[PDB]
Design an enzyme around this catalytic site. Structure first.
Site, mmCIF file in Angstrom:
data_model
loop_
_atom_site.group_PDB
_atom_site.id
_atom_site.type_symbol
_atom_site.label_atom_id
_atom_site.label_comp_id
_atom_site.label_asym_id
_atom_site.label_seq_id
_atom_site.Cartn_x
_atom_site.Cartn_y
_atom_site.Cartn_z
ATOM 1 N N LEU A 1 0.841 -1.188 0.000
ATOM 2 C CA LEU A 1 0.000 0.000 0.000
ATOM 3 C C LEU A 1 0.878 1.241 0.000
ATOM 4 C CD1 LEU A 1 -2.677 -1.047 2.632
ATOM 5 C CD2 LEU A 1 -2.900 -1.102 0.146
ATOM 6 N N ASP A 2 0.457 2.264 -0.739
ATOM 7 C CA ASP A 2 1.214 3.504 -0.805
ATOM 8 C C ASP A 2 0.718 4.463 0.276
ATOM 9 O OD1 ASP A 2 -1.215 4.278 -1.926
ATOM 10 O OD2 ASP A 2 -0.289 5.551 -3.447
#
Ligand SMILES: CCCCCCCCCCCCCCCCCC(=O)OC[C@H](COP(=O)(O)OCCN)OC(=O)CCCCCCCCCCCCCCCCC
Ligand SMILES: CCCCCCCCCCCCCCCCCC(=O)OC[C@H](COP(=O)(O)OCCN)OC(=O)CCCCCCCCCCCCCCCCC
Ligand SMILES: CCCCCCCCCCCCCCCCCC(=O)OC[C@H](COP(=O)(O)OCCN)OC(=O)CCCCCCCCCCCCCCCCC
Ligand SMILES: CCCCCCCCCCCCCCCCCC(=O)OC[C@H](COP(=O)(O)OCCN)OC(=O)CCCCCCCCCCCCCCCCC
Ligand SMILES: CCCCCCCCCCCCCCCCCC(=O)OC[C@H](COP(=O)(O)OCCN)OC(=O)CCCCCCCCCCCCCCCCC
Ligand SMILES: CCCCCCCCCCCC(=O)OC[C@H](COP(=O)(O)OCC[N+](C)(C)C)OC(=O)CCCCCCCCCCC
Ligand SMILES: CCCCCCCCCCCC(=O)OC[C@H](COP(=O)(O)OCC[N+](C)(C)C)OC(=O)CCCCCCCCCCC
Ligand SMILES: CCCCCCCCCCCC(=O)OC[C@H](COP(=O)(O)OCC[N+](C)(C)C)OC(=O)CCCCCCCCCCC
Ligand SMILES: CCCCCCCCCCCC(=O)OC[C@H](COP(=O)(O)OCC[N+](C)(C)C)OC(=O)CCCCCCCCCCC
Lengths: 69, 247, 98, 49, 45, 77, 80, 105, 88, 132, 53
Positions: free
Chosen positions: I43-44
């Site tokens: 996940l960013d």
């Protein structure tokens, strides 16, 4: 859990879930006091109260209005 | 609020409670209908006559207040429906762990509500003639003979007004119920600046709270400050210790 | 009652808001009683109400305007109503009874 | 309410400054008892609640 | 993306929150009170 | 005793200043604006009302000699 | 059994019945049997049925009396 | 001050603007289905301008993003009851733990 | 019975419910107590704050900006939630 | 936005007491750590000369809208009702009485409304029923 | 006890101690509403008069 500091903080209303060990004994001493006073208050209420619509008959008032005239 | 384990109070974090707490819901339902003056209930036999007597006065003030009161009856039938749906019929907003742990409360907490419910179904009808009775002796409340309009309130009113509160009451209730259920997209008001300004104003209670604090209370405390600066430690010290020491 | 949870900062000040605004009407209620003693020399119900018509209309207004302002505070009508919604800091039983 | 009777318990005198006389007097007329039903009844259930 | 929580908000509209269940009997005891009312016509008449 | 109070250096300055505002006070045009209002404007305004009505209010047992309600009705329609 | 306004009471009668001031009118005579029954009936919605019904119709005629007498004045506006 | 993209501190600022954006949407939108739709859009509006290598271009958005939130701020935001500002904040605080130092008054 | 506490086991089984329903998690790399949002799960920055916002709603708390950015694993969420008085 | 309450000064010079911009302590972030968490103040922080008006014990300050904007909305809302009440009064749109005002026998119950003789009567009389 | 991950909320089964009570209480409301209506739907709307029997 947490500490109530109950060694010294002794307000008249206990404090933080306070319950004495001899609570059953004291309540009957208190339940008497509520019963002793409720009975006592009923006696005085009957003896000292009155109906303020029957102390003076209208036949007595009718003389008052004319006397003041 | 006791039943929901998070003990929330914003009805925006409720939803679909009607089956997990059926008993709590019914008490609001019966009470709200009594509040909204549904015919045959207790609030009906007491609130409704007052709304008639605003019109039955047949003066200017009675006419103007009649619509303010009638809007109050309308809004009563509206914010009730908004309250009931948002908390009992809406799509759930709380997390699932709340719903699996939603129960009613102990019997001690339950008894007082049911007893008040019964009064809210039968209290008003039984007591109606004791107070509103035509000519019942209640001299403790004194009505000068030129101020009695209970006769014309009950006999002379237009036939459409006697139903006007209820028709906009439940009939207008359904319309709002559909929007909250089927067409909620209308109420996404943050986009509309006219509605956002209107919503902010009434949600902030006519901005009356801000007016009291920011202006009236602070000015009251400020006058205390000016007296405490220019008088008590000001002119009185100049004509006092500090001033006479200088001289 | 309203400030029962005195450790809560919000409940403390909302309790003060209820008392000070009510004491505003209480000051007017006292002033209404003084004009009731000034006009009739009495605060009894059996006396004052028996003299209602015979009294000057201006005097009844001075007394009753004070009663109205005092009643606006307790019944929380427009103008002296900011405290009513601050009262929800007390426990739920307090709100029901009050 | 039904029997047209009134009660008045007068504990003692409070203020007796010349003509201004005030008693610790408690009465129960129709209106006083019309308000003691909403007050005491609800408050009893509130305490029970 | 576009609603990455589709599989999360499944239960807000399914099970007991199906619209049939949400409005199921929202009027407490309509038919019991309604059913009784007809009987008083049978009892009186 | 044991100094049961955690004395604060900043509170002491605040307490020192608030009890010594007389030292820094000046009789500038701002003070005279306030001083005139409180020592002269208000006392004279109330002083006029007090002396104007001093003896003009016989409210003890005041009577009514003028009807309250109206007798005849004159409809617009 | 009421169809038209009945005869007015007398001044001394109201004293013995203590009829409230706002309801001392032509229909006061049909008030006394109603008020007496309510006191003996606890003001219930069923124990004073016909006595109450008679009184409400009396106030209707008493109200409808003023309707004709309201229009009579309104015609005198048309005189000038 | 200056804005340095791809630095850790600058990302956290953008993270903070994201919690302001979605919570504000949550405050106004009271249906989950309607909320996810709008919440999806805001992220798209947040991710479309993900790539910026210029200081001054980014600072205008920060100026604009603050304005977007301020005008759309809810007049009654949802707060958890025990979190500050909630309905149950500071209620029934457990008393302080400390020794009573007796004084001979 | 009233609400029976909230111990880490029930906390763990609810955070996993968040990530399982969150379909932006990279395939494989099963949800484990030692996982990393950016390294393992994938996940960013904008994705992780979505998980944090969902997590704070699930536990009915309000995670401030100061500590939410500190949570980098799945265990740190478990240990952060467990050390709060309003995690219900 | 974030504006400070009224009557807080722009400048002050109380000799050697430190100068510092006023800070509304009620608006400090409630999550940040403080030495005095209830008052949201850290130990030995300097105080403004009028700090008593800028803390948690002072009256609550609401900054959602400007104090002028609140007047506009407040006066407008009652201003709207003013025209609604004025037009009906100016237009006379309220209905007329459907019946004559209630009349009363026995000279309008003059004696029963606290009258003695026939000279005053009208002082105490109610609506006279002249149409027996 | 354990939290079951990814499950719907089924139609809850509360004790009919609460369920029946709310149904009777609600029934007591409507039945009264109908009972007054049949005997007062004229008077409530004003279409008739109480003494028009
Ligand atoms: C008891 C009677 C109270 C005395 C009435 C006099 C009120 C008064 O004169 O206050 C002066 C003040 C205007 O002066 P001020 O605001 O202090 O100027 C500084 C600007 N930075 O005015 C105010 O601050 C508001 C006055 C409101 C009065 C009601
Ligand atoms: C609340 C109710 C009232 C209660 C109090 C009533 C009495 C209060 C009287 C107040 C009058 C004095 C207060 C104002 C004087 C303050 C003196 C001052 O501020 O300094 C001016 C100057 C001193 O010089 P400097 O060192 O430069 O100080 C300047 C600081 N601004 O000072 C000067 O230059 C001198 C000024 C002229 C001096 C003329 C001397 C005339 C005689 C003295 C008066 C005598 C009064 C008593 C008389 C009988 C005595 C036996
Ligand atoms: C006429 C003007 C009144 C004359 C006195 C002026 C007020 C002087 C200041 C009183 C002391 C203020 C105080 O006690 O401290 C602040 C207290 C806290 O209230 P607050 O901040 O609103 O709490 C919100 C919690 N969420 O604030 C209060 O609770 C005070 C409550 C209001 C005080 C009564 C003021 C009279 C209001 C009249 C309104 C009608 C005007 C017509
Ligand atoms: C009647 C008593 C009149 C006394 C006048 C005192 C008024 C006063 O103090 O004037 C102010 C000034 C003091 O200096 P300051 O406070 O700095 O004024 C700031 C102005 N920008 O005052 C002065 O500088 C000189 C004032 C001293 C006058 C004292 C003489 C009074 C002698 C008779 C007493 C009666
Ligand atoms: C036990 C409660 C008392 C029962 C009263 C029985 C009764 O005779 O009154 C019937 C009453 C409603 O009847 P109602 O329409 O008011 O008038 C008579 C119509 N034939 O019915 C009631 O009063 C019901 C009262 C609540 C139950
Ligand atoms: C018509 C006249 C009626 C008078 C009848 C009086 C009944 C109430 C007695 C309360 C005693 C009590 O207990 O107050 C003291 C309570 C006790 O706190 P607790 O709950 O025991 O917990 C204990 C642990 N604390 C203290 C940490 C919470 O704490 C307080 O200091 C509360 C602030 C002072 C309250 C003042 C109330 C006084 C009543 C009003 C007087 C006019
Ligand atoms: C008609 C109204 C009558 C009221 C009473 C009379 C005024 C009261 C004065 C208080 C005195 C005071 O304060 O004495 C103490 C003061 C000074 O103050 P300190 O204590 O040394 O601190 C302050 C010192 N600084 C600046 C270093 C901090 O000494 C003096 O200045 C000495 C001279 C005072 C003469 C008093 C004459 C009185 C004449 C009254 C008729 C006009
Ligand atoms: C804290 C410190 C407070 C100090 C105390 C102040 C009290 C002031 C007293 C007010 C008296 C007042 O108002 O009297 C008013 C008087 C007279 O008014 P006139 O113009 O003759 O009235 C005309 C009347 N017509 C117009 C109705 C005809 O005015 C003065 O000649 C002031 C004299 C007293 C001050 C020296
Ligand atoms: C919000 C602002 C107030 C609402 C608008 C009032 C406009 C108006 O016209 O109000 C005037 C009104 C109406 O009475 P009227 O027409 O003057 O007299 C006619 C009165 N009858 C019918 C008894 C003969 O009386 C008032 O002032 C009432 C007080 C208002 C609250 C303060």
């Amino acid at each position: 859990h947490h500490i109530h500091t109950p060694s010294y903080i002794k307000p008249p209303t206990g404090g933080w879930n306070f319950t004495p060990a001899n609570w059953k004994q004291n309540t009957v001493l208190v339940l008497v006091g509520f019963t002793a006073c409720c009975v006592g208050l009923y006696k005085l209420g009957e003896a000292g109260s009155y109906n303020p619509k029957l102390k003076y008959k209208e036949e007595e008032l009718s003389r008052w209005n004319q006397s003041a005239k | 609020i006791h039943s929901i384990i998070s003990e929330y109070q914003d009805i925006r974090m409720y939803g679909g409670f009607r089956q997990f707490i059926p008993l709590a819901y019914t008490c609001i339902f019966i009470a709200s209908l009594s509040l909204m003056a549904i015919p045959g209930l207790t609030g009906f036999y007491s609130k409704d006559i007052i709304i008639e007597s605003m019109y039955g006065e047949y003066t200017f003030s009675g006419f103007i207040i009649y619509w303010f009161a009638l809007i109050s009856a309308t809004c009563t039938s509206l914010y009730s429906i908004r309250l009931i749906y948002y908390t009992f019929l809406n799509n759930p907003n709380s997390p699932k762990y709340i719903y699996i742990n939603l129960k009613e409360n102990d019997i001690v907490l339950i008894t007082p509500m049911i007893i008040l419910t019964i009064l809210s179904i039968f209290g008003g009808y039984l007591l109606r003639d004791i107070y509103l009775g035509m000519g019942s002796p209640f001299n403790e409340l004194f009505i000068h003979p030129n101020n009695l309009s209970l006769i014309e309130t009950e006999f002379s009113l237009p036939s459409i007004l006697k139903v006007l509160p209820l028709i906009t009451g439940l009939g207008g209730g359904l319309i709002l119920l559909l929007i909250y259920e089927f067409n909620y997209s209308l109420f996404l008001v943050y986009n509309n600046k006219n509605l956002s300004k209107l919503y902010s104003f009434f949600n902030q209670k006519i901005m009356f709270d801000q007016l009291l604090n920011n202006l009236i209370l602070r000015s009251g405390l400020n006058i205390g400050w000016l007296l405490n600066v220019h008088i008590d430690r000001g002119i009185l010290q100049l004509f006092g210790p500090l001033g006479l020491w200088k001289l | 009652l309203i400030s029962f949870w005195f450790t809560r900062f919000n409940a403390v000040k909302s309790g003060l808001s209820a008392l000070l605004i009510n004491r505003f009407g209480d000051a007017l209620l006292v002033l209404g009683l003084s004009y009731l003693v000034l006009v009739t020399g009495s605060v009894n119900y059996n006396t004052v109400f028996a003299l209602g018509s015979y009294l000057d209309v201006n005097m009844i207004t001075v007394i009753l305007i004070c009663f109205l302002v005092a009643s606006m505070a307790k019944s929380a009508q427009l103008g002296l109503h900011s405290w009513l919604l601050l009262a929800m800091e007390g426990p739920t039983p307090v709100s029901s009874l009050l | 309410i039904f029997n047209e009777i009134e009660y008045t318990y007068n504990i003692m005198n409070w203020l007796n400054v010349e003509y201004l006389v005030v008693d610790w007097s408690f009465t129960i007329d129709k209106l006083s008892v019309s308000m003691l039903v909403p007050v005491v009844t609800v408050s009893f259930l509130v305490h029970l609640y | 993306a576009g609603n990455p929580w589709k599989r999360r908000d499944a239960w807000r509209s399914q099970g007991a929150f199906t619209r049939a269940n949400r409005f199921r009997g929202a009027l407490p005891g309509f038919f019991w009170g309604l059913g009784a009312f007809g009987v008083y016509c049978v009892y009186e008449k | 005793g044991p100094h049961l109070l955690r004395e604060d250096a900043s509170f002491q300055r605040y307490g020192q200043l608030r009890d010594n505002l007389a030292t820094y006070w000046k009789f500038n045009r701002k003070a005279a604006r306030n001083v005139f209002i409180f020592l002269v404007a208000v006392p004279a305004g109330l002083g006029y009302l007090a002396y104007n009505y001093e003896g003009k209010t016989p409210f003890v047992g005041k009577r009514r000699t003028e009807p309250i309600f109206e007798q005849d009705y004159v409809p617009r329609k | 059994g009421v169809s038209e306004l009945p005869e007015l009471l007398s001044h001394e009668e109201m004293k013995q019945n203590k009829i409230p001031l706002a309801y001392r009118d032509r229909c006061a005579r049909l008030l006394v049997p109603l008020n007496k029954c309510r006191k003996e009936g606890w003001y219930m919605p069923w124990n004073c049925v016909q006595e109450r019904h008679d009184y409400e119709q009396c106030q209707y005629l008493d109200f409808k009396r003023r309707v004709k007498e309201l229009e009579e004045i309104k015609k005198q506006r048309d005189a000038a | 001050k200056a804005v340095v993209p791809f630095s850790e501190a600058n990302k956290k600022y953008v993270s903070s603007l994201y919690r302001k954006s979605l919570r504000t949407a949550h405050d106004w939108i009271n249906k989950t289905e309607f909320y996810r739709v709008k919440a999806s859009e805001i992220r798209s509006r947040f991710d479309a301008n993900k790539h910026i290598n210029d200081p001054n271009e980014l600072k205008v958005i920060f100026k604009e993003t603050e304005a977007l939130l301020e005008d759309y701020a809810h007049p009654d935001p949802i707060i958890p009851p025990c979190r500050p500002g909630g309905s149950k904040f500071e209620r029934n605080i457990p008393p302080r733990v400390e020794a009573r130092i007796p004084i001979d008054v | 019975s009233s609400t029976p506490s909230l111990t880490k086991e029930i906390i763990y089984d609810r955070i996993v419910e968040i990530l399982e329903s969150y379909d932006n998690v990279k395939q494989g790399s099963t949800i484990s107590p030692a996982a990393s949002f950016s390294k393992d799960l994938g996940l960013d920055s904008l994705d992780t704050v979505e998980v944090l916002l969902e997590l704070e709603n699930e536990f009915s708390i309000l995670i401030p900006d100061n500590e939410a950015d500190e949570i980098k694993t799945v265990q740190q969420a478990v240990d952060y939630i467990a050390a709060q008085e309003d995690s219900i | 936005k974030s504006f400070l309450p009224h009557f807080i000064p722009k400048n002050y010079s109380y000799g050697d007491y430190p100068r510092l911009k006023p800070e509304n302590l009620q608006k400090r972030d409630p999550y940040l750590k403080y030495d005095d968490q209830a008052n949201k103040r850290n130990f030995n922080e300097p105080l403004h000369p009028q700090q008593d008006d800028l803390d948690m014990w002072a009256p609550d300050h609401f900054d959602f809208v400007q104090d002028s904007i609140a007047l506009k909305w407040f006066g407008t809302f009652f201003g709207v009702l003013a025209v609604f009440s004025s037009v009906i009064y100016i237009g006379g749109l309220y209905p007329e009485k459907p019946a004559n005002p209630r009349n009363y026998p026995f000279s309008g119950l003059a004696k029963d409304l606290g009258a003695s003789s026939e000279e005053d009567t009208l002082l105490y009389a109610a609506k006279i029923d002249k149409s027996i | 006890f354990k939290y079951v991950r990814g499950a719907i909320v089924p139609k809850p089964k509360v004790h009919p101690g609460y369920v029946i009570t709310s149904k009777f209480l609600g029934g007591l409301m409507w039945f009264w509403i109908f009972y007054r209506a049949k005997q007062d739907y004229p008077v409530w709307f004003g279409l008739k008069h109480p003494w028009e029997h």
